[PDB]
Symmetry: D2
Subunit: 268 residues, 4 copies
């Protein structure tokens, strides 16, 4: 018994083998899921990465800003999994924000063109993915997205914080639409994980006073967490996501599950 025996799950957002999306996929496969992967921009490079997953799985190009890709997605998936099958799961593990909206760059200096692009990719896309894919989702199934607790402002995360606050609201509306199909929609609010986006968008959003000032702030998780937090281990987050994909949280929708070692429950 896999936790996800014979479930068909789409997984977006793999780019390196540190990606949260990757570990979600590895764990979903270990628990008997047959996957359909999506990737953005660097398909050849993503394909080397996905070969390292425990099982082969079809790979589809999806740039959540591409009108045509979303219009096509529903059909490209049906053709990848077998005509007359549907998905039981969907994982949105996608984010972006320009350099201007992040790190040491003044919050007031981010121009709206740039903020808008981030909100498009990191928040609105959760709705446009749900729109494209609900028609090919079974009753019982689960949409899951990735969140970083935005309830309080923090240094550096800046306009991404705002995108996550938007995503949180988007998720509650998707839950309403998804409800008509017997589908749940939830976010996992993870603690920090060494992934590409952490480094090149955030660590590289500061340079010098930079990446050791990542470090201290992120022990505003390991310290607070009553069971601790390990930034190098995505397994706990991946498992938490699989739990939402499974049949074992069947009464939770529009909601947020914290995979953060409990840190958000503790002030110190």
């Amino acid at each position: 018994t896999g936790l996800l025996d014979g479930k068909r799950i789409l997984v977006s957002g793999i780019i390196t083998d540190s990606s949260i999306a990757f570990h979600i996929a590895r764990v979903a496969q270990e628990q008997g899921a047959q996957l359909v992967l999506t990737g953005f921009d660097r398909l050849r490079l993503i394909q080397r990465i996905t070969d390292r997953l425990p099982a082969k799985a079809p790979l589809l190009e999806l740039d959540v800003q591409n009108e045509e890709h979303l219009a096509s997605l529903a059909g490209r998936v049906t053709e990848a999994i077998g005509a007359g099958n549907k998905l039981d799961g969907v994982v949105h593990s996608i984010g972006f924000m320009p350099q201007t909206g992040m790190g040491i760059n003044p919050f007031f200096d981010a121009p709206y063109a740039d903020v808008s692009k981030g909100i498009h990719i990191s928040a609105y896309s959760y709705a446009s993915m749900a729109k494209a894919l609900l028609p090919i989702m079974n009753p019982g199934g689960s949409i899951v997205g990735m969140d970083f607790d935005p309830s309080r402002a923090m240094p550096a995360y800046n306009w991404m914080t705002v995108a996550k606050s938007a995503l949180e609201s988007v998720n509650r509306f998707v839950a309403r639409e998804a409800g008509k199909y017997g589908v749940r929609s939830n976010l996992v609010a993870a603690g920090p994980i060494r992934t590409l986006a952490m480094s090149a968008i955030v660590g590289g959003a500061l340079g010098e006073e930079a990446g050791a000032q990542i470090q201290l702030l992120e022990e505003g998780w390991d310290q607070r967490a009553p069971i601790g937090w390990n930034m190098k281990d995505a397994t706990p987050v991946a498992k938490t996501v699989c739990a939402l994909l499974s049949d074992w949280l069947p009464a939770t929708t529009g909601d947020i599950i914290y995979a953060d070692g409990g840190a958000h429950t503790q002030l110190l």
Copy 2:
């Protein structure tokens, strides 16, 4: 196969076969857990009820107000599950509030003696259960308790609402202590279920409209006669599959709390 293969889990709070505790136990057993049950006052009557669970399991008396029962509990459990074993799970599904602190009885008329008793049984006991049982819990294991969303005031629930607000805080402190043992502590905030205590809150058709301030709001709906979804949600926290969630609250309420209408 089972979500909880070979896990040893204590389950408090069974009294009838409608009890949320009962369905937790049934589902935990269906997923391969070996249980140890706790019950209060009416042990003879509880035992007829537990015979209807899929498997037999030892039953132990625990009145969370009884000094001696808590002091003894740790050892009475070790003897029930095998000397040299420990628990992997603990479920607190316990509540009480005098009639004065609930229903049509004015909120201002509940005397503190009565409120205090409710807080003792419904909130503090979560801490005293955790104290008694953490020394016999394995790393990885989960403590779970039952909550009803107290963030907003509502008619009838009155001083139980206040007990739940207290319980929510108690849970976050237990998580700190439980953390030293590698143990998670969480609450499930369930939607309404027809149980004995629900009867004990108070005509009972005015309950009904307020409780469709769940089925209505819930994007996937809510069925007050079906505890399965709640029981499954609890088992999820008992399992290895939410390993980075502690001090926290999980809403098994059909999503109702995320919707204003």
Copy 3:
């Protein structure tokens, strides 16, 4: 003694005399504030409306989407209030969302161009107003914006709900920047008010079912809620403009008759 004796406060967002902005301004003036008003697009029509306030006050064009207006705003205000003076208060009472992102139009059908425009006007603008104006704000002063509780999803409000969730986050970051100047930044989360924009959420054909949902305020509110009376909201905003909430920033104050504290 006015609550706001000799305070200089900018007030955006007036368009009719039902506008929440209007009642904020009336109450600020009743309490001794000298105002500087902003309006968008229909300046001639806004000016008839502002003449009905207890005192006349200069009116400046501000379209929060206009690069040049924001760059210029700081100086156009300094010239309106006296060179070598500054503002003590700023009120953002601005919102917009295309028809597609709202009412009976499916949530999944709003194209991002349209959502983005709403977020620009309703959320980002709070930051760009703060950017333009903090250099000419005194220590002690208050920035205030208008919110509608987005914590929970609801029918109709749709993508405006998402804009408010964004605004709530934006406000906490503005508070950080405003802090360097000795300035507070807060939002008032008001209950519903019969204003122009409220009619703009459907029209009609759905818009009587607004009413039941809005008694998910008057019913819940332990002191009730009157959709025709903006006074309580205007006063709540003035409280934040005053010296009497000096240790509250990045935050949200509910002027909703207590409705958000009650499930029923």
Copy 4:
């Protein structure tokens, strides 16, 4: 001129001149309120303290655990302010917790007798004060109580944290009852202030590996606060309470106002 011209306001919880209650009273009087003070146990000593307020004001004995004092309070107040008058305001600035429920003493080791006492005094009393006083309150008036943000667990505050979580719920119920009279009920959630209860119940709830560990946690306010926090200045808190007593927050009940320099809105 005064923010509270000719308002009649009861103020509980004065014991030293560092008491938050004291500064509430001083500020209420500076803004034209006529007060009625309550005090507990050490009435002679409280009376030296209240003589230092800008105006004299009658002092009444109130031990919120005393059946008879609450039953009598309503009438003892009517007699202090004039027959045929009523109160426009009530300030609950009261708390207590045994040593066992606090500081270095293990959370698990507090016996319920002791926790119960704390909950009685710190939370339930808000309801029993409201019960005693609403019959002699005018429409428009305000009940206000003092809170310390209990939404996340923290070191030391222990079972007082639980009392405040209870108080927050109690306040929402009081608001419903108070609503029938046209009365608001709110809490102010203050940042830390050097008061007696801080020191002898909390700083002295540790002694040796002790009251300097309070210190780090309390700069989990001045640091986070975008406009900073001064533990020696109760004025900002007292003013915030007066704001709720005034006519200027007339649409806010059942609620919580953070007078904490914004710290609770900031993760770092």
